[PDB]
Each structure stands twice: as structure tokens, then as C-alpha cells.
Design a protein around this ligand. Structure first.
Ligand SMILES: *[C@@H]1O[C@H](CO)[C@@H](OC2O[C@H](CO)[C@@H](O)[C@H](O)[C@H]2NC(C)=O)[C@H](O)[C@H]1NC(C)=O
Ligand SMILES: OC[C@H]1O[C@@H](O[C@H]2[C@H](O)[C@@H](O)[C@H](O)O[C@@H]2CO)[C@H](O)[C@@H](O)[C@H]1O
Length: 246
């Protein structure tokens, strides 16, 4: 398991937790030096448990699918909560079985279903460590509407941060003050799948992408990614979604 506590948390411990989060996911091959996520894992081992503690010390345990880094659900005291999606339902057969009751959310974990449930896009939802403390707090007590938004904060603080160093960096700048995500952040989140595909396809195309990826950069400008020499591939992306899942 991996853990993070917001009490006493700073850019340092956050980075360490994100480093752990990354190291917890297994892989057998690296593509252009980037861990390649497995096509699939069978049974309970398919899920990674993250113990998160808010500033007061309360905790929720989040189950993550180690093949894609998708959040399946979490445990709040003695109640389990899982998205309304096949994968999560499957996940419920293995994790938090001893919870006293199981609640299925009214939506899947997809960014689009989450934004609807929440009544606003990620664009306008401030993130950072403080925001992650709010999120943990919200999920301790069931509220599907407040949860959608806390869940959008959680996904980005943790899964997207493991996925991209840049996003991990974005969150460390927000260690003591939340801020809506830069568009480069939303761009990267939206492009993880495609970038993972083209990184793997480049492998026998001499590091050239079969199809270029369009991103938005730091300065907020439209940019094309055509091959593995881009900083995005050399520095940024830290985990790759196996094409066997794309
Ligand atoms: C792969 O991607 C490279 C940049 O990420 C790109 O190099 C450049 O493209 C032109 C030069 O002809 C410039 O617009 C740009 O400044 C160049 N970037 C750098 C840092 O040199 C390669 O040309 C791309 N290769 C392929 C096969 O498309
Ligand atoms: O949308 C980002 C979000 O991914 C969720 O999974 C989605 C997925 O993007 C889509 O291909 C599919 O049709 O719905 C999936 C779940 O039902 C994750 O659960 C989440 O953790 C985010 O990364």
C-alpha cells in the first residue's frame, strides 16, 4: 500500500508519496525508459490501496486499478463506495469486502460524468493540497454531489500526478494555495491515452509517432508532439497505458 498525510505535508513529502504511488504499479517492460503498465493483472493484485489522511487525521482508503491508474472506489470508516462502472463492480469483489455496507455512486469515474454530477468542468475546480484535504473530508460522509467534485480533485492530485511529472509539479506549487488547473494540465490528462499509444507505436517507427498529438503547453500555446525527443516524452509522462487497453 501507499500512504500520504496532509498534516505536515509540503512539496517534499507530496513528491515522495507520488514517487511511491508510481513505484507501486508493476510493469515488466519500459518503453523509451518509461514504465509500461501491464495489459492486465488477475485477482486482488490488480488493485492498489492508498491510505489518505486529511489534516485532522481522518482517513479514507482508495483502491486503484494498477493497470490504468483508475480509481475504482474507496473506504470511508465502514462504508465502501464504488463508481457505477463494470470495472469498479468487479473491483468490489476483492476490496473492502468487510465494510458494513456498500454504496454505488450514481455515476462512473469518467471526467465527463463527474463534471455533470458536479455541475462544473475541471476547468473551474481549484486543486492543490488544501483542496485534497477538503476532498478527503467530503468523502468521509456521503454526498453524491459534493463527492463528484471531491473525486475530480482526488483523481488529479493522485493518478494524474503519478502520470505526469508536470502535473505533480503543478500540485506542489499549490501546496498551500489551490488554483484551477492550467490548461496544459487538462490537456495532458485528456491526452494520456493517446500519448501512451503513440509512445508504444514509435517503438518500431524509430521513435516517430504514427499520429502526432496536439497539446497545450506551459505558456498556453498549441503544440504538436511528433516523436519521442519531446520533453513531454523525455521528462513528463511517467507511466504508460498499455495499448492492449486502448
Ligand atoms: C520530432 O520532434 C522534434 C521537436 O520535438 C522536431 O524537431 C524540430 O522541428 C523543427 C525543425 O525542423 C522546429 O520547428 C523545431 O524547433 C525542432 N525542434 C528542435 C528542438 O529541434 C523533429 O523535426 C521531429 N521529427 C519528426 C520526424 O517529425
Ligand atoms: O476520464 C478520466 C478518468 O478515467 C476514468 O475511466 C473512464 C475512461 O476514461 C473511459 O475510457 C470509459 O468509457 O469510462 C471509464 C470509467 O468508466 C477513471 O475511473 C478515472 O480515475 C479518470 O482517469
Amino acid at each position: 500500500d501507499v500512504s500520504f498525510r496532509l498534516s505536515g505535508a509540503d512539496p517534499s513529502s507530496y513528491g515522495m508519496f507520488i514517487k511511491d504511488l508510481r513505484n507501486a504499479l508493476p510493469h515488466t517492460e519500459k518503453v523509451y525508459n518509461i514504465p509500461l503498465l501491464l495489459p492486465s493483472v488477475s485477482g486482488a493484485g490488480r488493485y492498489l490501496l492508498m491510505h489518505l489522511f486529511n489534516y485532522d487525521g481522518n482517513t479514507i482508503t482508495v483502491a486503484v486499478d494498477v493497470t490504468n491508474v483508475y480509481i475504482m472506489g474507496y473506504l470511508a470508516l465502514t462504508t465502501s463506495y464504488f463508481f457505477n462502472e463494470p470495472a469498479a463492480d468487479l473491483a468490489s469483489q476483492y476490496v473492502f469486502r468487510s465494510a458494513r455496507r456498500k454504496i454505488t455512486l450514481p455515476y462512473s469515474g469518467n471526467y465527463e460524468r463527474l463534471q455533470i454530477a458536479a455541475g462544473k468542468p475541471r476547468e473551474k475546480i481549484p486543486i492543490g493540497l488544501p483542496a485534497l484535504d477538503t476532498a478527503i473530508s467530503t468523502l468521509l460522509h456521503y454526498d453524491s454531489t459534493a463527492a463528484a467534485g471531491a473525486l475530480l480533485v482526488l483523481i488529479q492530485t493522485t493518478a494524474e500526478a503519478a502520470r505526469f511529472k508536470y502535473i505533480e509539479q503543478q500540485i506542489q506549487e499549490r501546496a498551500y494555495r489551490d488554483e484551477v488547473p492550467s490548461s496544459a494540465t487538462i490537456s495532458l490528462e485528456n491526452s494520456w491515452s493517446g500519448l501512451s499509444k503513440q509512445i508504444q507505436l514509435a517503438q518500431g517507427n524509430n521513435g516517430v509517432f504514427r499520429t502526432p498529438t496536439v497539446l497545450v503547453d506551459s505558456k498556453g500555446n498549441r503544440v504538436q508532439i511528433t516523436n519521442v525527443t519531446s520533453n513531454v516524452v523525455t521528462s513528463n509522462i511517467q507511466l504508460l497505458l498499455n495499448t492492449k487497453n486502448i
